[PDB]
Design a protein around this ligand. Sequence first.
Ligand SMILES: Nc1nc2c(c(=O)[nH]1)N[C@@H](/C(S)=C(/S)[C@H](O)COP(=O)(O)OP(=O)(O)OC[C@H]1O[C@@H](n3cnc4c(=O)[nH]c(N)nc43)[C@H](O)[C@@H]1O)C=N2
Ligand SMILES: Nc1nc2c(c(=O)[nH]1)N[C@H]1C(S)=C(S)[C@@H](COP(=O)(O)OP(=O)(O)OC[C@H]3O[C@@H](n4cnc5c(=O)[nH]c(N)nc54)[C@H](O)[C@@H]3O)O[C@H]1N2
Ligand code: HEM
Ligand code: SF4
Ligand code: SF4
Ligand code: SF4
Ligand code: SF4
Ligand code: F3S
Ligand SMILES: [Mo]
Lengths: 214, 912, 337
Amino acid sequence: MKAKRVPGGKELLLDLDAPIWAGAESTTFEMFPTPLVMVKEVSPFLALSEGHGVIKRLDVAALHNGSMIALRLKWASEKHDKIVDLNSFVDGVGAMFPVARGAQAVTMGATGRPVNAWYWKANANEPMEIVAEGFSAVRRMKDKAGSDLKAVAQHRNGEWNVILCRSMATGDGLAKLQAGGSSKIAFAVWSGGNAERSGRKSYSGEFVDFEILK
Amino acid sequence: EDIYRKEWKWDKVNWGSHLNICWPQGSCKFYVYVRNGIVWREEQAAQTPACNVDYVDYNPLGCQKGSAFNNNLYGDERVKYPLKRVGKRGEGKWKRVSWDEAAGDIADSIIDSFEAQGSDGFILDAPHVHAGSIAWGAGFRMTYLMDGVSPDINVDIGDTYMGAFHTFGKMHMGYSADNLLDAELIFMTCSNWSYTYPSSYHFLSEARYKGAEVVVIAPDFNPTTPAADLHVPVRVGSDAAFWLGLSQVMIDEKLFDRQFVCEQTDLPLLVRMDTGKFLSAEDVDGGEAKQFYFFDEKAGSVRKASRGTLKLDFMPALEGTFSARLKNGKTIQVRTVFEGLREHLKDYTPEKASAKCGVPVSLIRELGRKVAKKRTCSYIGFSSAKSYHGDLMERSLFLAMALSGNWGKPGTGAFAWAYSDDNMVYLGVMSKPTAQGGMDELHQMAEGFNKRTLEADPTSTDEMGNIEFMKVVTSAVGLVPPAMWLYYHVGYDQLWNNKAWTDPALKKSFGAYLDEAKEKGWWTNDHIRPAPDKTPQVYMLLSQNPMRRKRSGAKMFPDVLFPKLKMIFALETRMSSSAMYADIVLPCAWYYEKHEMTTPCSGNPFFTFVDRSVAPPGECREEWDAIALILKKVGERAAARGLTEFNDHNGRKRRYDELYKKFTMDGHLLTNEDCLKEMVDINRAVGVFAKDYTYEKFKKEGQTRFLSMGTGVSRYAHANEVDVTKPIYPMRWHFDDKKVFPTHTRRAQFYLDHDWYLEAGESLPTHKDTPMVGGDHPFKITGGHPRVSIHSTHLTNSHLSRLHRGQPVVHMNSKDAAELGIKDGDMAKLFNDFADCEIMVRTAPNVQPKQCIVYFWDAHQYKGWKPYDILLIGMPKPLHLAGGYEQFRYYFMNGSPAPVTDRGVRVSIKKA
Amino acid sequence: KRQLVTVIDLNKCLGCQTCTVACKNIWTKRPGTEHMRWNNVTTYPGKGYPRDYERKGGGFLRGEPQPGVLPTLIDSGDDFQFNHKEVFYEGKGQTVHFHPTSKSTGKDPAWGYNWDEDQGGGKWPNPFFFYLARMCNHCTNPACLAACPTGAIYKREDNGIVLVDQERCKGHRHCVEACPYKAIYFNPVSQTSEKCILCYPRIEKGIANACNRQCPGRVRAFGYLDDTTSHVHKLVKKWKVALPLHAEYGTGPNIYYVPPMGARGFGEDGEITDKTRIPLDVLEGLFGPEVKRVLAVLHTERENMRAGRGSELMDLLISKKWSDRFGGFTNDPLTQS
Ligand SMILES: Nc1nc2c(c(=O)[nH]1)N[C@@H](/C(S)=C(/S)[C@H](O)COP(=O)(O)OP(=O)(O)OC[C@H]1O[C@@H](n3cnc4c(=O)[nH]c(N)nc43)[C@H](O)[C@@H]1O)C=N2
Ligand SMILES: Nc1nc2c(c(=O)[nH]1)N[C@H]1C(S)=C(S)[C@@H](COP(=O)(O)OP(=O)(O)OC[C@H]3O[C@@H](n4cnc5c(=O)[nH]c(N)nc54)[C@H](O)[C@@H]3O)O[C@H]1N2
Ligand code: HEM
Ligand code: SF4
Ligand code: SF4
Ligand code: SF4
Ligand code: SF4
Ligand code: F3S
Ligand SMILES: [Mo]
């Protein structure tokens, strides 16, 4: 997919109903259940997961203004944005980028081949920065590791609409997202209604090209 | 890992315990952990050693209510400011006022009633000790100074052993819990230690492992049965038949201890076959009316049974029918009580007794044989006293104990009702401190009674001298049988004279028996108070909650009493159901928030210090201080109103302006700490504490074993000295020393030859089914003290209420419920001919068919605030109005008809 | 490597819940822990705690991990709210009464912690029940640990205490589903899971854990399983009268229970028998195939005592000196962290 340059300020890119989003390049990703049999050594119990991955489609548009880059993500879901019981889970979405050469999205990277994921949860104020060296070493970074990753979200008419926004320039260890550059991207989405969290989810599959234009 | 380590921190630790009357009072010593100026938590100190190396210690003590009491101190059940009623009584509309306003209104109402009609207008109704010994002392001292009326706490609650009273002439006997370790056979009956004695239940399970056989006699397979080898599934109220079956076994199989029976009891005394009365020397040669006879078979003659000792110099006859020539020259047949009993027990063969109590023959015969051969200790709980015929049930158990020689010996006993209450009663009556000679008048009066007693009868014992003293002093201080004022002033005559709800073997109603009894001078005007022509006007709630405690009080109080009352005031820590109907609620300091001492009995025989760990919150006051302030206000308000004197019940004048000085001993007693120090001095003076065991030592150690039963009834009733190196058990003086019993016959007396008993069919222990109190309804309702609370203290506690369903529950047999279309968790109506209530249903197989159970709840936990108690009536046993017999008598906590007979009341149940 | 263990003598347990409150009043009055009864006591037969935990999967079968399901707030005993203000101060008179409200549904509860108290099983005149105290078993092969994909759960090598690292925990709750005892509990405020910490702040100062120390029934013994002088070693390893709860769940639990002897039952003829009414297969369901042997040992040893022969076993189970139950954890509870 391609992130197009747009003339506005950060409060065009953070405005879910901004007409600019109406002309963005939108890519529909088929979402598949994660192959959790793969996680047997990390959790034999998680590997027994049945029926995860109920969200089959995630629409994503990407725009930037040279200083911040924004992803707009949209999918069909009931609104599970609150822990209402001890068995309750919340909706979530993740966008992942490689931070090292040869990092594979399907394993969430590997030792020495890290990936960086923007992670939004419906009951969280703020999104989280995750750095992972395999699904066996997925770390949430303290106070975003200095990142300004922001999120805006609204559920309406059976869909989540969320924007994940971040400065284009970042320190070491977080995804390099330069204008005129090309990274790679993958997504996961969690249905809180289907008890989806951790590895129980659907995902876009392996990394696809992510071209940041201008 | 430091986030949990964070929690295990505090600022200071003090000694604490709880003054709520668990019973036997646990007197559990806790560490009270304070932080940020608040009680954070508590934990048992577990510093109560065994009596000696061979016994189990008492550690750690405690229970779940005590161990979570910090939650009470910060709970929304607390009243922290004086409240004054705004709406109707019970409407739940209150406003905060000052202590000055609140104590002022109370004082004015006291004054108003005293001016109108003298001191009979004030009733401190049956306060318990939950607020503390010092609070009990305060309330009693106040009422005594004012000559107000104080219905008897023990008779009012229904904690008595009238069968013991009538058999032995006393009831204040006990053992300590470790005494079970010396028993080979243990009977838990009319009791539920799992719920009611968790601090020392362990002695029961540990006795079991040492080899003691544990038997629970209960209609239901009750919560104590996890410690039991045997459940004896008596029909509710049928225990007499069980115990008579056991006695029949021991007699028929010749297993009884003949020597013990002949020495200790009336079983060998001769009874006239013409009149049914003991053969007396008056009858035979014109001697004493109370000189009785054995038959000496070897001698071929009647021989005088000594009134002065139980020691035998020959073996009296048991079996047989004999003759005696009277002073008339007429010869009559006479036989021993035993010979009558042999006849009577023909109706209680195991087959017949089984038909009557539902216990299998095999078990009756097995236990008959075991009781005769095993050192046997019982715990009869206070469901016995709450059974109409508990006296019969108890007499029958004591007959089995007699026949097996099971008293006066290590590992024997029946209950834990020996205790020193000297600290409370001297605090209540002395005019000056102990250290100033405050006990001198009482101690010289006590001697007077002894001298007078010996004069009347030189064979009399100290124990008898003490009873006479007690009879007099009880009435001198305004402690009165609670049936009287309930009957005359709260409309209970309309319930208690219902012949449908009376034992059908009786020839007349409660009130008819009352009239006969007062005609004979058996009850006087110092018993019947307030007098029938006075009106109660001021009613003080202190450690008492009539809306659930009084049987049918939830109806009779609002409908009959409250309308006559000008002032109802409560000294409370908590918004009780009864306080909701008060005009004034005065907030009090709770446990850990005021200096106190626990009030132990034989069971857990140690006093424990309760520090003031934290200041009371809001405007909570200690009860002594609260009462002191009321009394100052009485004086001040009287003075402002230009009034000087009021009349006491005998028409003597007392000054309003001296009440406060008298109460406080001219400023010497203002605070709990003041009173605690005085109670320590009292304990030292009477031998309960060592003479050198000062308050300083008490505060530091936090607890101490008591060294004696003090100077009150227990000292003599218990009939043994306290030796802290061995388990406490009663009646040793009777057995080892051959000390006489304070009874008609001078013996442990199974034949009561008083006319009322003869006519009622109760001269011997006998089985009578519970009267059909409530009408002809198919369930018999029983109860028990709550596992989940000490009385209502914790029934309004959120934290503790989460250990259970948080609401009133009736336990029903599963099939019974199923047959009524009722499932577990359904609501049900309980009802009878008198009233009804709604309660959540618990179904269990462990409930006896046609039994249902409600462990009590506070009244405002029920829909419409109608507790199960509303339907319980409280029919007092009319035979307990009897006088004209040595052991038929009233003094404080002992005797008079208890309006408490709720166990086995009839109810119907339907789904709601 | 060592393992702290508790022995719980079901003959002695009186269902008083002191152990419940002992735990709660140190550890589980924090927001989000109020429903947690890390030490829990319920009546058996019953639904247990959490409700129907024995139906909720987890653990291992043939050493095969089993899927599990999450308990609800209600399953976990709820956190009943009460209405003091409404009853006392709102001018509603007798039209309202003091009663609980579920924290989950906001309505009257139809279940809660210990709701099936004193109910049990059997059929009249042979009803049976006993009280069953439970905590985390600090398993040798903990399913919770195996289940957490973040590796937030660990087992201390020094004393075998299993802990959830509250900083690393993300509240995934796989551990909760995996623990066949349902002895890990979600904290919806922190959004982590919590569990019995074997009072480690206390035990590291030589102070016995609170649920053991505060038990008035003197039911509880505590110590290191390898300590041959301890009650726990003598009951579990030597006499072998203290049995694991649901060992078939595959986790190697390290709480051990002395099964209940129970009261003699009545026969089909209504007469008293010489046998307990508690069905052996019921006790076997909980404590395994050794129950029959154990009951026989208890009865034999009890007879040895009664007959004047003595019995170490009875001496151990009675414990005339209370502090001897605690395996050297005898410091007074007066040392802070
Ligand atoms: N059906 C049936 N009826 C029965 C019984 C039964 O088994 N079944 N049993 C009895 C027996 S034996 C007793 S001892 C009663 O439960 C005692 O009733 P009481 O009214 O004292 O208790 P309650 O707890 O309700 O009221 C006492 C008040 O004392 C308060 N309190 C407790 N501690 C303090 C304190 O420190 N300061 C002050 N000022 N107050 C305190 C308490 O709030 C309660 O409202 C009687 N009837
Ligand atoms: N937790 C707790 N403990 C307390 C108290 C408390 O409020 N809470 N209060 C203390 C006080 S003041 C008292 S008076 C005691 C009372 O405690 P206990 O003396 O133990 O008396 P109850 O609780 O009335 O006993 C209940 C048992 O009576 C049995 N029962 C009922 N009817 C009959 C009958 O006809 N025959 C036989 N054989 N049994 C029958 C039932 O099975 C029931 O389990 O508890 C003391 N301890
Ligand atoms: C390719 C798109 C993916 C994205 C955007 C993604 C993102 C994430 C994120 C943000 C988390 C952290 C959740 C949290 O902290 O609560 C996570 C956890 C996890 N993911 Fe993925 N993931 C992807 C693919 C996968 C796949 C294919 C698997 C399984 C084969 C997987 C397995 C896991 C596991 C086992 C965890 C839990 C680890 C932990 O919380 O420590 N992920 N993932
Ligand atoms: S309430 Fe009674 S038994 Fe319970 S801890 Fe306090 S004193 Fe002990
Ligand atoms: S009982 Fe459950 S939580 Fe505790 S160690 Fe075992 S598997 Fe883990
Ligand atoms: S060991 Fe400590 S943390 Fe565990 S249940 Fe007992 S009191 Fe609670
Ligand atoms: S404190 Fe002891 S006796 Fe009470 S419920 Fe807990 S384990 Fe059983
Ligand atoms: S699965 Fe792991 S993340 Fe926490 S809730 Fe359980 S320890
Ligand atoms: Mo009582």
